[PDB]
């Protein structure tokens with residue numbers, strides 16, 4: 602039946618001061634690297650298509666118009682009207698159902714993310730840990746965002762993983778805990 | 783601390799036929815202006831406190847030969863733009879995996895709560911039904927969710943069912959995924 606392809610470009614001040622997110626039925630196809638000036642597949646399956654398209658001339662214009670509003674409009678009303686803030690929500694769960702001793706992957710799902718500026722840190726009984734994948738923010742219907750952070754791990758009975766989201770640098774944190782079932 | 787979006791949604795049906803198209807500028811979470819292929823120009827929306835800003839945004843965008851001509855053509859791009867992979871997307875599927883187990887009782891007093899774990903599928907569309915000895919069991923505390931995305935381009939969800947263990951009883955979770963004609967099943971006996 603119907604399917605929705607979304608090409609959201611946004612700009613703000615902070616963390617990623619500019620981004621592009623192209624989805625299809627809410628799942629992200631590929632984002633866009635403004636440095637190397639190229640699209641980045643969310644999955645290798647995609648690659649080939651993020652390669653072509655050459656719609657660069659639009660992105661260029663969109664980008665400019667965006668940055669432009671940030672430049673002029675913002676300062677004008679900074680402190681004049683209220684900032685749409687969205688208190689982020691974090692949830693944690695496993696990719697596959699729980700099987701002790703057998704390899705798995707924890708997922709930290711962030712929702713109601715606004716603005717798209719954050720930092721995710723994983724711990725295990727407060728003991729910080731790395732090996733986590735980059736947190737990917739993606740645009741979502743309704744002018745909002747969501748982000749995911751994955752961490753492979755081998756589940757054990759006395760585990761206690763926590764996913765810490767730190768919104769807007771230092772204003773408002775969110776901590777989601779996960780224990781064995 | 784503000785944020786702006788230059789959003790352009792492209793809606794298409796299977797095969798690859800464009801159905802709708804929009805372009806819309808939005809400052810803060812408020813929405814400013816959207817193109818209108820009828821009027822052929824970029825028309826303002828949300829006449830809020832920012833009604834003023836709205837007019838401007840559009841005018842500026844309007845006085846741009848490229849943009850207007852970019853938009854105008856729109857739907858025709860939508861096809862080309864998506865075409866090379868549209869078949870892949872509309873027809874890419876990962877079959878679900880099911881596993882039934884018992885978990886600590888949620889709501890209700892029954893001594894056993896069964897949990898059907900359906901995971902690793904795409905698209906999100908899926909239906910779970912339970913069966914007691916080959917017999918369909920209507921919903922009462924059969925509370926699931928709405929297929930949680932993994933971002934991994936896969937989805938998962940879970941279905942619960944409370945019961946009373948009587949040997950000889952066999953419970954089966956039936957799952958029909960829009961990506962597989964073969965209904966999957968997983969049984970559970972006391």
Ligand SMILES: *[C@@H]1O[C@H](CO)[C@@H](O)[C@H](O)[C@H]1NC(C)=O
Nearest residue numbers: 602603604793794795801802
């Ligand atoms: C998608 O929504 C309906 C239901 O499939 C479809 O008829 C329509 O063509 C699409 N939406 C628009 C706005 O065209």
Ligand SMILES: *[C@@H]1O[C@H](CO)[C@@H](O)[C@H](O)[C@H]1NC(C)=O
Nearest residue numbers: 706732733734735751752753
């Ligand atoms: C998790 O395991 C898979 C398969 O071994 C691997 O591709 C991935 O890089 C691992 N870790 C992360 C953080 O993705």
